[PDB]
Design a protein around this ligand. Structure first.
Ligand SMILES: Nc1nc2c(ncn2[C@@H]2O[C@H](COP(=O)(O)OP(=O)(O)OP(=O)(O)O)[C@@H](O)[C@H]2O)c(=O)[nH]1
Ligand SMILES: Nc1nc2c(ncn2[C@@H]2O[C@H](COP(=O)(O)OP(=O)(O)OP(=O)(O)O)[C@@H](O)[C@H]2O)c(=O)[nH]1
Ligand SMILES: Nc1nc2c(ncn2[C@@H]2O[C@H](COP(=O)(O)OP(=O)(O)O)[C@@H](O)[C@H]2O)c(=O)[nH]1
Ligand SMILES: Nc1nc2c(ncn2[C@@H]2O[C@H](COP(=O)(O)OP(=O)(O)O)[C@@H](O)[C@H]2O)c(=O)[nH]1
Ligand SMILES: [Mg+2]
Ligand SMILES: [Mg+2]
Lengths: 430, 431, 430, 431
């Protein structure tokens, strides 16, 4: 009941999904053999959400992996959890997008999308009541931002009543790993605005800042960042898999967090982030978690929260703690920081509590913020896009795959309209 | 002989009902297995030889809470067909919990209710537990109330709704849900008691000396209040009362049925030994401004009718003296057009101590149900929140996309304004 | 010859009737088994007044118990004298009046009345000369006020030549037990005035004072209060059940105590009331009893006798005592307190003497006063009725069962007219 | 599944490939007997049992150089049919290498290329090693590029041409050949890296402290660069890259596809002990003006796109911090219209150490491919040298005697002038 199908697209998507399934299997006590070996039946009470039962007590993730190059698939297969995935789910092309969004949405993605959709239907119709889709992709790359966008459009066409969640990595402001990143980001968001129902923005610069300043790490590899993102996703989805005093749902979060259809970009956060050295010094308590969640520097998005009032804020606590302390902390946050919330929303905090904390932690909270500060990221992307597009830099690659200037102009206009709407709602008063 | 039915809708309703049924089983000596090693006939049907079954229907769109109940310590108590679960939760969407999904479960719920009603005689009325904030506990409650009023027009319906706290809130669409459910249910319910989470938290901190109260203690307090209300139907005693008596005494006008529950003897064990807990002291505690179960200032509004449900060894002379002393108070201002302020009910059975509860054993206990005009402040506050959020159609497309028109919002707003105007009018003195 | 049936209506009616039958059985020496075990032969001389002989010398009271809820009946059926009553007499309903007079007089009482009247006729035919009907009543409630009034109207139609006596509990002045007590009281007296023949108004407030001020009780339960009322009821009819130097009768009481048909509300009183600690310090004598009977604080009605001149006063003494001493005391009372009696009545005191005192007492007396001071009690009810009626409070409950504003307006007219009549004779001068 | 084909044309191209393949065999472990004592599937066909054969084609009009290969230590490795030889060198004459002799041999070469293409699956692209100054490296490569574009239009072509040195010269007709081949190859090759003999000489003498460099050391440096480019294919690592990604990131405009090459950690063993060789230090070296492998001043022109291909134990956080410092330098001038100009690629496999090479083992290594406007000076210099010789019509009769037309020389000059104009236009900043 209420099953979720997980889709991984792009190199970054697959890298995140590997750690995501690792941590999920850790929560439910599923060994890399694919057989349950845990010690709490509550894990199996709702294992149907992410897994399908098989012969000999075998369980397999309800995951679908998509790529245009076999390198990432081969790397995943050699991984510790490669065997639990059903090999029929591995769908991969040969040409590769090569960071070209047009190639990843019109030339290579078009040929491959049929198999992905067939596997999607096979997984979905095998469930009694589908809850929603979750997609892990990257905006910067080609394969990610093209194939994931096309797949989201197809699925929205096929499943209008369901909800699609994308944990998309946004380009970092100062550090950029690709030259066509603004083009890819704008082209992808042009459809992500109109198709998806809830999108979580992740910036690698903020993840590096969290790893270094807070976690006190010296050599943070992509494993740690992917682990943080996976922990965020697990905190988001934990309401379905376990009982709690206030059990939420994906649709519940969508209703509580999205005031208007086009404003569904969030900035997630994880509360108990402490280094190994400072484990003893900090007292683990609800006020401590609340203080960490609302920290300006503790947002996985590159935006500055102080530059814009939040519309709504959802905090999903985990573990056993008193509700009184939670609501008192939320009231204190809304009192002290009353200048950082919209006056036309009376109460801004959505609270969910679950009785199963993350493995190895007494208690934890997952932050979700619909802040207006993301207009800064959007306008930065738009400015980079305009700067590149004024002289038509790199446009011949896109036009060589059938694209045209009209689509670029339309996407830029849509992004500008989204920025204008965000600024308007940030400005307007009661 | 006098049957009563309890219906728990939504997560809050289900958990409160679980606590209430635990309290009932402890009170009547019924083991969780259902075989106790008359009084029980008012709530439990003695189906089979030596087994009793509660007359309750648990409904929730999200199967999580009911599934937890099934695996809980009270597994072998409830009838398996009495627990009804949906597939997808209302997700705080009133339209989903009333139109889209409630239509798929209302038929089964009504079938179960009809089976229970045909299985009993002398049905007193219905008890409904739900939350004004959530989606299921609002939309499904309104749908069920409409259906029952259609099919059981001669019976009485009683609700225990979790009214949203003034400064504390959990769902962003709580004003929307509350306004919609009040508009839809104001014409069907006979008397709907309301409590606030913030007020119960304040009571727990101030009186119980508890600094980290969870939902368990709140639900136990609510269960104690419900047990005090229903005591007269389950135990013999001087000056018994019935639900129809509640409806007659506490409802001056058809649309003013929003009394506030209150439990007077709420003390901790460490503080019990230093207090005599006399009848006069208990009655004075029941009227303490900072001891209401709803975060409203009683001194800001006139009382209209307060019903007192005493328990334990209580001498009626003490009740009369305490009532006279209360009437002599100038601060406690009753409406000049209701000289007979109080309805008094006494019962011999004292309250029972929960094995794990934070309440100490008390020789006496009362419950106050006051229909006061101070609730207009809370109504105005929720109305203002609704007006602010709806002023720019925020969080509206969700309701629109689930088979609901925009004009229903305006109609509910107008109805709530009319209710506030009626409360203000009633407040006006008589010449 | 001269048999009296007993009818109990409402919760208060049944509670009073239980103790009434307890004290009657104690007087006649009948154990809860229903078998005679007393010593004095005179007890069985007139046992047919309240009882019917049966097989095996079993005696059962000529009592009928009516209710709309089974709660009170079960307590009576499980009480000390539950097996005394014949089970067929226990007529009861299911829905219950719920303090709604219309519900207890038009809807719930309409169904159950026919069965009760059938039992009434069945009991009446068992006798040869029916003396009159006796009803224990409560004005405040719904079952008592509603059903009891309806039953009175039916019986009056069936037996126009027989007397009906109601011992109705009148709502207290300060302490109120129900919100709608003024409504029920006014509606009931609208019919009790034109139907009944002798009514003994009793107020709980006055009974509490007697238990505290005189009996020096600290925890006066309803059992003790009903005992005082029960002792009064026994004293009234003791002239029928026993011989005496000057024997009265129920019909002989109505003639003396009712100057005019509309004025038959009495304030009963009991003479020998003394606390346990003061038993040895007070001399039991005729002047001692007479002083207590005319004591202002000794009236079971909340009214103040000093505020109104008596119309007629009947004192029913019990026990062996000289008629000379009794007559002299009454002359002194009418002489010393001549300002408290109407000048247009040459002689106000009716005296009844019976040889057998109550159980355990050397001698005792019962006071029955027809005082105009009860006008103050009625105008208080009218005042409370008017205030709640101008704003039409709680009227939707009464109108929902078939009533109308016309009935309420008619009722207040009857009450105000009755108050005018009392004030008329109070101001009347020879 | 991602096979890539390398074609070596001309004496310089063949010798570079000879050192290049010596590097690949050492990397994967492939013995000279081609018997491995997966990853290698991207370059070597698993022909037979227990043997691997590289996907390479060697073509040279003069049979001398290839004859040395057949007599070399790598005789048994290559497929004997894959080594195609003529019978008369182009003699530095572009017409002979493209019109007269190139026609006789091109048909056989295309047969071999088609044979490999059918054998392989998921073909990535072509690697061509050739020289601008020579005739065989210029005339034949232009002919080969023209053919492949028609037959394999959907695949990318990558060249590694020996750009003529500014001061050092070997053939008197180097300006003629370079202009002719660039005009005929500008419309075919997707992206061609260029390296100068003179610049490598300075790097070899200064960093490596080599008194008397030879072509063996020079070609080994080139092998390290091409190894880094194909590293993301032959090995798996964080943030992998593909050849198609190179075309997208480094080619803003179709006619500007001439990026430089640079290898940062080039130090001797005697100096490696003292150097920290940190990620920040390595990245600083990659942008050193004297460390570019083309004799041009990077400071005399804007950067347009730079791709960094890290190798070894490199933490991406270190790359992000190092990149930020580079962008903050005032001297390092990027074009304003390109805000982000870095395409970062990382791999886990560190560089291997050639047994006879002068490079010491290094835990980390990067290769910088930068598309910069500095080459405008280089293009002008060769263009100027072309103009002086053609003004006297010197050496023209040799080309005319092999089917050329005099008007073709003007057209190549005209197109080359247009290319210089295009570089200047792009170098202008916006308004
Ligand atoms: N006093 C008390 N209140 C509770 C408890 N559980 C939930 N609530 C209240 O219920 C409100 C939310 O409504 P829910 O009942 O959870 O929602 P629902 O009826 O299940 O419908 P959905 O939104 O679809 O889940 C919260 O604001 C809480 O205040 C409880 O155990 N005790
Ligand atoms: N880096 C490097 N450059 C070389 C090497 N060998 C030759 N060159 C340069 O490449 C240029 C072209 O010479 P060739 O490759 O022999 O010319 P070709 O393609 O063989 O054509 P022919 O003149 O017919 O031999 C020469 O001027 C050399 O400077 C080498 O091994 N390494
Ligand atoms: N957090 C995180 N981000 C990654 C990882 N790998 C790649 N990325 C991001 O993904 C982007 C590269 O896009 P990519 O998916 O490889 O291109 P594509 O294959 O054509 O979709 C870069 O901007 C990286 O920031 C990873 O392991 N973790
Ligand atoms: N003296 C006395 N009065 C009672 C007793 N029980 C109830 N009453 C009175 O009866 C009134 C309640 O009305 P009730 O008869 O219970 O309502 P009903 O059952 O609908 O007729 C209260 O005002 C009480 O004062 C009792 O045991 N003794
Ligand atoms: Mg729910
Ligand atoms: Mg040669």
């Amino acid at each position: 009941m209420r099953e979720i199908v997980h889709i991984q697209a792009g190199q970054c998507g697959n890298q995140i999904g590997a750690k995501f399934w690792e941590v999920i299997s850790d929560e439910h006590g599923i060994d890399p053999t694919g057989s349950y070996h845990g010690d709490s039946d509550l894990q199996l009470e709702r294992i149907n959400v992410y897994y399908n039962e098989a012969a000999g007590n075998k369980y397999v993730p309800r995951a679908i992996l998509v790529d245009l190059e076999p390198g990432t698939m081969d790397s995943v297969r050699s991984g510790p959890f490669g065997q639990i995935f059903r090999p029929d789910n591995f769908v991969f092309g040969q040409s590769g997008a090569g960071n070209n969004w047009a190639k990843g949405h019109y030339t290579e993605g078009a040929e491959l999308v049929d198999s992905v959709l067939d596997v999607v239907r096979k997984e979905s119709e095998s469930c009694d009541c589908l809850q929603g889709f979750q997609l892990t992709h990257s905006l910067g790359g080609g394969t990610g931002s093209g194939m994931g966008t096309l797949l989201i459009s197809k699925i929205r066409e096929e499943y209008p009543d369901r909800i699609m969640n994308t944990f998309s990595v946004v380009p970092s402001p100062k550090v950029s790993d690709t030259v066509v990143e603004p083009y890819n980001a704008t082209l992808s968001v042009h459809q992500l605005v109109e198709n998806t129902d809830e999108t979580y923005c992740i910036d690698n610069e903020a993840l590096y800042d969290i790893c270094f300043r807070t976690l006190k790490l010296t050599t943070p590899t992509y494993g740690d960042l992917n682990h943080l993102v996976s922990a965020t996703m697990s905190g988001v989805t934990t309401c379905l898999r376990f009982p709690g005093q206030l059990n939420a749902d994906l649709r519940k979060l969508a209703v509580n967090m999205v005031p208007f259809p086009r404003l569904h970009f969030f900035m997630p956060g994880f509360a108990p982030l402490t280094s190994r050295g400072s484990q003893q010094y900090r007292a683990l308590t609800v006020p401590e978690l609340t203080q960490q969640m609302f920290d300006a520097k503790n947002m996985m998005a590159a935006c500055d929260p102080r530059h814009g009032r939040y519309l709504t804020v959802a905090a999903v606590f985990r573990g056993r703690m008193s509700m009184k302390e939670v609501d008192e902390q939320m009231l204190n946050v809304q009192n002290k920081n009353s200048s950082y919330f919209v006056e036309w929303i009376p109460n801004n905090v959505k609270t969910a509590v679950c009785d199963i904390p993350p493995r190895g932690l007494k208690m934890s909270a997952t932050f979700i913020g619909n802040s207006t500060a993301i207009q800064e990221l959007f306008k930065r992307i738009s400015e980079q896009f305009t700067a590149m597009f004024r002289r038509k830099a790199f446009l011949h690659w896109y036009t060589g795959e059938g694209m045209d200037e009209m689509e670029f102009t339309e996407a830029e206009s849509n992004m500008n309209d989204l920025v204008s709407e965000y600024q308007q709602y940030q400005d307007a008063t009661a | 002989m006098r049957e009563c039915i309890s219906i728990h809708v939504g997560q809050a309703g289900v958990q409160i009902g679980n606590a209430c049924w635990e309290l009932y089983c402890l009170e009547h000596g019924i083991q969780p297995d259902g075989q106790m090693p008359d009084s029980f006939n008012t709530f439990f049907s003695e189906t089979g030889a030596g087994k009793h079954v509660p007359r309750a229907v648990f409904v929730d769109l999200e199967p999580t809470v009911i599934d937890e109940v099934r695996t809980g310590t009270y597994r072998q108590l409830f009838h398996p067909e009495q627990l009804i679960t949906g597939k997808e939760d209302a997700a705080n969407n009133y339209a989903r919990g009333h139109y889209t999904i409630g239509k798929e479960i209302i038929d089964l719920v009504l079938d179960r209710i009809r089976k229970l009603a045909d299985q009993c005689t002398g049905l007193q009325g219905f008890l409904v537990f739900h939350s004004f904030g959530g989606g299921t506990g609002s939309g499904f409650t309104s749908l069920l109330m409409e259906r029952l009023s259609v099919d059981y027009g001669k019976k009485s319906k009683l609700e225990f709704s979790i009214y949203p706290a003034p400064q504390v809130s959990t769902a962003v669409v709580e004003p929307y849900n509350s306004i919609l459910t009040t508009h839809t249910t104001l014409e069907h319910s006979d008397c709907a008691f309301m409590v606030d989470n913030e007020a119960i938290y304040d009571i727990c901190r101030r009186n119980l000396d508890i600094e980290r109260p969870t939902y368990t203690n709140l639900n136990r307090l609510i269960s104690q209040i419900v047990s005090s209300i229903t005591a007269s139907l389950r135990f013999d005693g001087a000056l018994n009362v019935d639900l129809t008596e509640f409806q007659t005494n506490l409802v001056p006008y058809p649309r003013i049925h929003f009394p506030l529950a209150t439990y007077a003897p709420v003390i901790s064990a460490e503080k019990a030994y230093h207090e005599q807990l006399s009848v006069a002291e208990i009655t004075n505690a029941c009227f303490e401004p900072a001891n209401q179960m709803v975060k409203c200032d009683p001194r800001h509004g006139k009382y209209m009718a307060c019903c007192l449900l005493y328990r334990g060894d209580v001498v009626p002379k003490d009740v009369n003296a305490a009532i006279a002393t209360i009437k002599t108070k100038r601060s406690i201002q009753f409406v000049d057009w209701c000289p007979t302020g109080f309805k008094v009910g006494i019962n011999y059975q004292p309250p029972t101590v929960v094995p794990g509860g934070d309440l100490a054993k008390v020789q006496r206990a009362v419950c106050m149900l006051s229909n006061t005009t101070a609730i207009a402040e809370a109504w105005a506050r929720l109305d203002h929140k609704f007006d602010l959020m709806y002023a720019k159609r925020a969080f509206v497309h969700w309701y629109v996309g689930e088979g609901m028109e925009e004009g229903e919002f305006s109609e509910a707003r107008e109805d709530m304004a009319a209710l506030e105007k009626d409360y203000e009018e009633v407040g006006v003195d008589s010449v």
